[PDB]
Amino acid sequence: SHMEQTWRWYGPNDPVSLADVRQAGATGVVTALHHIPNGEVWSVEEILKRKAIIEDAGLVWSVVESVPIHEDIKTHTGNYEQWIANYQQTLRNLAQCGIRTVCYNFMPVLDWTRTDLEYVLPDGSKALRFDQIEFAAFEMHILKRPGAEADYTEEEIAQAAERFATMSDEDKARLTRNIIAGLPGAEEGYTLDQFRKHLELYKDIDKAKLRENFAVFLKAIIPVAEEVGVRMAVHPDDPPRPILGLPRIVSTIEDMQWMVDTVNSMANGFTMCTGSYGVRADNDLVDMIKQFGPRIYFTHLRSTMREDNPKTFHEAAHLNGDVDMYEVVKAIVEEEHRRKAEGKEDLIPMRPDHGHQMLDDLKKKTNPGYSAIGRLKGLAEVRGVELAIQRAFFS
């Protein structure tokens, strides 16, 4: 109702139109210049072009998701210094164009990851799924990573071998593409061989080293963001665990603390993605929001559901997953009101993030799962929750 409601739109080629976005009840658009090569400067011309198209539809461009971080920066090799300078200039250009919140991530090699993009739920809608056994089967029988076995239980290893033996040729190829070709919003994509040799760049990069590399990026980027009035909002790892023998360092409350300890500036902030942090039961989403609320500049309000094997999860309906959406939204609302009591008024933009593929969208080739109807539904659900919290607690 007064909640800042935003919606990820991929641009002119997105099958979801800006008219769909408005009718969904979003007033803001989340987007990026996906056609601009990784690490290159986003020009004022290109930024203003996307901005104009959005304003044309009676919308505003609210949040950038994402400005991609080149792999050279993550490995601290090659042309990292130039890429950093370009990132800095991109932020200057964005700010000069009046776009002041930037979502980004530091997931190395792979971005957000699923094994199944067409998982049929009991109601017939399709969800995204990370099947731990499918993922083990890929790692040990397709990628054949030495020695991936350490990441798994004896039971999971046995189940993987069995799942792999039931897979058709096409099952194996589709599983592979699902994991490495890049899901919607990802700025990296690989063939199996490209992927395998890219992994080698990380043989001596452990959690501590990757943090060092991230610190270099942050200490260079944040003062620029602060100088120009842009706020940075880091997106968590998805899933928030170390996969493929690579570290993942934006997964827990300790990682959040590490980022604040590393760069104190308030320009160094967070995207509270409840779908990603909520994958693992030991993340206390409400406490995360209570402790880091002043630095939360963007939220993704969706839910996953852990299955019998707690590392297996699929995307749930927004109000029916592991995320206690009531408590999460209450905490966000409480944070917005404490800003207002500090004499400010600084709303936290949200987007529904992912939705199930349902109704008319089932007959379509969609961006997984950035179909419109399921995301409209999640947005409507959270809108209702937030409105009632506002009235129950802040009227």
7 binds, among Cl ion, Mn ion, none (CB under 5 to 8 A by kind): Cl ion
Nearer to Mn ion, 66 or 132 (CB): 66
Length of the chain as a residue count: 395
Q: What is the smallest separation between the CB atom of 377 and Mn ion, expressed in angstroms?
A: 17
Q: H-helix or E-strand containing 328?
A: helix 325-341
Nearer to Mn ion, 92 or 300 (CB): 300
- Cα torsion 248, 231, 97, 86 to 10°: value is -40
314 binds, among Cl ion, Mn ion, none (CB under 5 to 8 A by kind): none
Pull the structure tokens for residue 26.
């979003």
Q: What is the smallest separation between the CB atom of 33 and Mn ion, expressed in angstroms?
A: 19
Nearer to Cl ion, 195 or 298 (CB): 298
Residue 321 Ramachandran class (φ > 0 left, ψ -120 to 50 alpha, else beta):
beta
Binding region for Mn ion (CB under 5 A) out of 72-80, 115-123, 213-221, 348-356? 348-356
Are the C-beta atoms of 30 and 11 separated by less than 8 Å?
no
Q: Quick one: how far is CA 137 from the chain centroid?
A: 25
Are the C-beta atoms of 262 and 210 separated by less than 8 Å?
no
Residues of span 347-376 touching Cl ion by CB under 5 A: 351-352
Q: What is the smallest separation between the CB atom of 266 and Mn ion, expressed in angstroms?
A: 22
Which residues have C-beta within 8 Å of that of residue 363, sequence separation ≥ 6? Answer: none
Binding region for Mn ion (CB under 5 A) out of 102-110, 257-265, 353-361, 381-389? 353-361
Strands 101-104, 60-65: pairing is parallel
Residues of span 256-285 touching Mn ion by CB under 5 A: 273
Choose which of 300, 306, 314, 377 interacts with Mn ion (CB under 5 A).
300
Nearer to Mn ion, 88 or 274 (CB): 274
330 binds, among Cl ion, Mn ion, none (CB under 5 to 8 A by kind): none
Nearer to Mn ion, 84 or 234 (CB): 234
E-strand ranges in the chain read 6-8, 28-31, 60-65, 101-104, 116-120, 126-130, 231-234, 268-273, 296-300, 304-306, 313-315, 350-351
Catalytic residues: 235, 273, 300, 353-354, 370
Which residue's CB atom is positioned nearest to Cl ion? 351
Q: How far apart are CA 227 and CA 223, in angstroms?
A: 6
Q: How far apart are CA 167 and CA 190, in angstroms?
A: 22
- Residue 7 makes contact with Cl ion by CB under 5 A: yes
351 binds, among Mn ion, Cl ion, none (CB under 5 to 8 A by kind): Cl ion
Nearer to Mn ion, 284 or 345 (CB): 284
273 binds, among Mn ion, Cl ion, none (CB under 5 to 8 A by kind): Mn ion
List contacts with Mn ion (CB under 5 A). 273, 300, 353
Residues near Cl ion, by CB under 5 A: 7-8, 351-352
